RNA sequence: GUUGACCUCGGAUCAGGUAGGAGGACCCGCUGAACUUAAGCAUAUCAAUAAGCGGAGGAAAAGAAACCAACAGGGAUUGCCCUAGUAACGGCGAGUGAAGCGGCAACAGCUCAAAUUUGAAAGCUGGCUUCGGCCCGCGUUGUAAUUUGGAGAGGAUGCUU
RNA sequence: AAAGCUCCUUCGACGAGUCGAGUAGUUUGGGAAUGCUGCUCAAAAUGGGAGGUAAAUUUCUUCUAAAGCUAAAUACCGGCC
C-alpha cells in the first residue's frame, strides 16, 4: 500500500479507488549492480593498462589547480555533462588513496 | 576464464599497451593481398562472441577498403539538372564500409555462407575487417542442428540482400516512435499507404 | 480554378494512382475457402475445442476505461495460485503470458476463480489405454456432452457495470459540504500552487532560524 | 590407449558385484588448458605455474 | 654437427565436393532523372517514382520488446475497417500528411557469449572393414552435457513422472 | 539414469572504436534537428536508453541495446491446369 488515491479526478492525487499490492522484485531489474567477481577484474587490468592520454591532463590539472577547468576540459572530451561529473569524481579517489596511502 | 579479461582489456584502446600492439600490427597488414586467408582468428574473444567456432568447416578472411566518401561518377562536373542537386562533392554512401568488405569476400568465395564480421584495425587510408565463413556442405556441419539450419536454399548471399547484424542497422529494423517509416520495410509501407481500395459495397 | 461557393476541394490524385487499385471481387470465393479450413482442422482436433483459454483484461486508457475485454495470457502469479505447474498449461488449451503483472489484488482474484472452475470441467484421457495414471479420468465419465467453440461458453459475461440501481428513500447520502462544483475548483487549484506553497513555507523556517 | 584398459577394468568389476572406485585410484596428474589453469590459481589452488614466451 | 618437432607460405591431371546461365508478374537492397503543376521561375511538386545494377522463394520479408503509455494500466509479427484528410510540415504559396487506443482473421514459441568434466575430450570429418570394430587426423588459443533474466546456481524436503 | 512441485541465510558472471556528443550531406509529418552515412573526440555499474521544446538542480514511470532461429492470416494470371 505505497499511497492511498483520493477517488476523484482533476486533484493532486487523483485515481480511482484500488488495493495497491507489493510484488516480488523481477530478476530483470539487477542489470547495474556490483559483482564481487567483476570488481576484481576490473581491478587488476587498471594496474596493467594504466591510464590515458586525455585523463593524465586533467589529474595533473585537478590537483594544485582549478577544479572548474577540470570540469570545462573533461565535457568537451566525453561530450556530456552527465558523464564529465562521474569521471572528474572518480579520477578524485585514484589521487586520494595514491598519496595519502604511503 | 582467460576470455573474460581480454573482454576487459581491449575496452581501453588507448593504453600504452594496447597503442604500441596495433600500431604494430597495421604495419604487417598492407603487406600482403587486399584479400587473403587468415589461419586463425586475431581476437578471439570477439570471434567466439559471434559464433566462431574451432572445428572443420569454419574459416576466416580478412579485407581492407578505401576509407572515404562517395564521389559522384558524372563526366567532368555536368549532371544536366536543377540546381537543387547538383553537388559532387560530399555526398555520402548510404552502406557502412563494414558491408562492402563483407561483400567483396563474397564473391571470392563463392561457395561459402557469411556469419558475421568485426572491426580489426584502421588507418589514414584504410579500414581492416576480419570475416567469419561456413562451409554448407561439410558433413561435421549439417550433423549438429544449431548451424545446419543456414544450409537451406533460402539463406543464399544473404550478404548482399541485407539480412547480416550491419544489414539491419542500415535499414530501421527497430521498434518504437522513432523507426515508424522502415519497421517493416521502408517499400512495402509506402505501397501500403499509397494504395487505393474499393469494396462491392460502398 | 473555382468559380462559385464552393468548398475548397483536396483530392490526393496526382501521383500514378492507376498502378495501384485493388478490386475486391474475390469477397465471396475467399469467405469460402475460410470455411473449408475451418472444418478441416476441427476434424484433426477430434474431441479437443478449437480455441484457447483467455483471461478477463481491463482497457488501459482514461477513455474506454469502463469495459472489459480478453486478454492474451495468464500471468506466472495467476497460475501459481490456481496450482498448474508453468509447463503442464500450455498443454492443455490453457494459454500463457510472460510478460504481464499483477499490480493489484481485483484483477487478481476475478482471473483465479475463472481458471479454477475450467480445471473442474477438463476431461483428461490417458496416454496409454491399457496403463491409466492416478490424474486421469477413470474411464467411467468419460461419455459427457462436450462444448468446442469455448469461446462462447467462456466468453466475458458482462463487461459494463449495470445501467442504473434503485435504493430506498432516507438512505440517500449526504454530499460533500461546500458541494459539487466547489469541490473540483479547489482541486484544481491546489494542483497548480504545490510549488509556490511549499517553498515558501520552507524558506520561512529557515529565515526564522 | 591407456585409457581403454581402465575402462573395461572396471566393466568387469561392476557386472561382479564390486561397485565403482573400488580398482582404481586417485589420479594425480599435470593441468593443461588456458580457462582451465585461470581457474585453478584464483582459488589458490596452484603451487607452480609456466608460461611460453 | 646429425636427427626430430612447431609456426607461416606453396606445387600437383592427388581423393571427394561446390559456384556461374536462364526466368525476374509478385519480393529484399543500391543508384537515380526530366516532362508536368505553381497560369513566369530558382526552394517545392511529379518522386524517396521510370530507366540502370546485385540476390532468393512458392510465397518473400518481419518477429518473441532497450515497445505503447500516464491508465482501475496494455503485452511477439503480418493484414482488413476505423482513427483521418486529423496532429504536423510548406516562397505557411501550389501542395503534402503519419501514430497510440478500438473491432475482426489467424495464433507458437525459442538457443548462443560470459562458470573448472578436471576423479579421467565424456565430442567429430575421413579410410579400411565383415558389420565387430580398427587406424590417422581436427581439437585444450576449448569439441559434448549443464545455464539464458520468465530466471538460475548452490543448499533443504516429500511425493510424482 | 533423467524430469516436475514447495521454501530459504547467501550468491547471481549478462555482448566496445560500440552508445553518446560535435560537424557535413541526404531524407522524413518529426518542428533548437525522425532515420541513414562520412570525419574528430570517446564512456559507465543500480549502470544504460526512452518519456515529441534547447539548459541547470531534485524526484518518478517503463524496458535491458551493440549475437541468432521459426508455421499460419498477406501479394501475384509470370509457369502448368
Excluded: M
Excluded at chain 1, 495497491?20 to 581491478?43: D, H, M, N
Excluded at chain 3, 483484461?57 to 480478453?70: D, E, Q, S
Excluded at chain 3, 498443454?91 to 475463472?114: F, M, P, W, Y
Excluded at chain 3, 494542483?191 to 520561512?204: D, S, T
Amino acid at each position: 500500500a505505497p499511497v492511498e488515491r483520493t477517488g476523484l479526478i482533476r486533484g493532486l492525487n487523483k485515481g480511482h479507488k484500488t488495493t495497491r499490492r507489493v510484488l516480488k522484485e523481477r530478476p530483470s531489474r539487477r542489470k547495474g549492480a556490483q559483482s564481487k567477481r567483476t570488481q576484481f577484474v576490473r581491478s587488476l587490468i587498471r594496474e596493467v593498462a594504466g591510464l590515458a592520454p586525455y585523463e593524465r591532463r586533467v589529474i595533473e590539472l585537478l590537483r594544485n589547480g582549478k577544479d572548474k577547468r577540470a570540469r570545462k576540459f573533461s565535457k568537451k572530451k566525453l561530450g556530456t555533462f552527465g558523464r564529465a561529473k562521474r569521471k572528474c569524481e572518480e579520477l578524485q579517489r585514484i589521487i586520494a588513496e595514491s598519496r595519502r596511502a604511503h | 576464464g582467460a576470455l573474460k579479461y581480454l573482454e576487459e582489456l581491449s575496452k581501453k584502446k588507448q593504453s600504452d599497451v594496447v597503442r604500441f600492439l596495433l600500431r604494430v600490427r597495421c604495419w604487417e597488414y598492407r603487406q600482403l593481398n587486399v584479400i587473403h586467408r587468415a589461419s586463425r582468428p586475431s581476437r578471439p574473444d570477439k570471434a567466439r562472441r559471434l559464433g566462431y567456432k574451432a572445428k572443420q568447416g569454419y574459416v576466416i578472411y580478412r579485407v581492407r577498403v578505401r576509407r572515404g566518401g562517395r564521389k559522384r561518377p558524372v563526366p567532368k562536373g555536368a549532371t544536366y539538372g536543377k540546381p537543387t542537386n547538383q553537388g559532387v562533392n560530399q555526398l555520402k554512401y548510404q552502406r557502412s564500409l563494414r558491408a562492402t568488405a563483407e561483400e567483396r569476400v563474397g564473391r571470392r568465395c563463392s561457395n561459402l555462407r557469411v556469419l558475421n564480421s568485426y572491426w580489426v584495425n584502421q588507418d589514414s587510408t584504410y579500414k581492416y575487417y576480419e570475416v567469419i565463413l561456413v562451409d554448407p556442405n561439410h558433413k561435421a556441419i549439417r550433423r549438429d542442428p544449431r548451424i545446419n539450419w543456414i544450409c537451406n536454399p533460402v539463406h543464399k548471399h544473404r550478404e548482399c540482400r541485407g539480412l547480416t547484424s550491419t544489414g539491419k542497422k542500415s535499414r530501421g529494423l527497430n521498434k518504437g516512435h522513432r523507426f515508424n517509416k522502415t519497421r517493416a520495410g521502408r517499400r512495402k509501407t509506402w505501397k501500403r499507404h499509397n494504395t487505393l481500395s474499393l469494396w462491392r459495397y460502398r | 480554378a473555382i468559380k462559385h461557393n464552393q468548398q475548397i476541394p483536396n483530392n490526393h490524385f496526382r501521383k500514378h494512382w492507376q498502378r495501384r487499385v485493388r478490386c475486391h471481387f474475390d469477397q465471396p470465393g475467399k469467405k469460402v475457402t475460410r470455411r473449408l479450413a475451418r472444418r478441416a482442422k476441427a476434424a484433426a482436433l477430434a474431441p479437443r475445442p478449437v480455441d484457447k483459454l483467455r483471461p478477463i483484461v481491463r482497457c488501459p486508457t482514461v477513455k474506454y476505461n469502463r469495459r472489459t475485454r480478453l486478454g492474451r495470457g495468464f500471468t506466472l502469479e495467476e497460475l501459481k495460485a490456481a496450482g498448474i505447474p508453468r509447463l503442464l498449461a500450455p498443454t492443455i488449451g490453457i494459454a500463457v503470458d510472460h510478460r504481464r503483472k499483477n499490480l493489484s489484488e481485483e484483477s487478481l482474484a476475478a482471473n483465479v476463480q475463472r481458471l479454477k472452475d475450467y480445471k473442474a470441467r477438463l476431461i483428461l484421457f490417458p496416454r496409454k489405454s491399457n496403463k491409466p495414471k492416478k490424474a486421469d479420468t477413470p474411464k467411467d465419465q468419460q461419455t459427457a456432452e462436450t462444448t468446442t467453440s469455448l469461446r462462447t461458453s467462456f466468453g466475458v459475461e458482462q463487461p459494463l457495470a449495470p445501467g442504473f440501481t434503485e435504493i430506498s428513500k432516507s438512505e440517500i447520502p449526504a454530499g460533500i459540504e461546500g458541494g459539487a462544483y466547489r469541490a473540483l475548483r479547489k482541486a484544481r487549484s491546489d494542483a497548480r500552487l504545490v510549488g509556490v506553497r511549499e517553498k515558501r513555507a520552507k524558506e520561512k523556517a529557515e529565515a526564522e532560524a | 590407449q591407456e585409457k581403454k584398459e581402465r575402462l573395461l577394468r572396471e566393466a568387469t568389476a561392476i557386472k561382479e558385484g564390486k561397485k565403482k572406485e573400488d580398482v582404481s585410484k586417485k589420479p594425480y596428474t599435470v593441468k593443461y588448458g588456458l580457462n582451465h589453469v585461470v581457474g585453478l590459481i584464483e582459488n589458490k589452488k596452484a603451487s607452480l605455474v609456466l608460461i611460453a614466451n
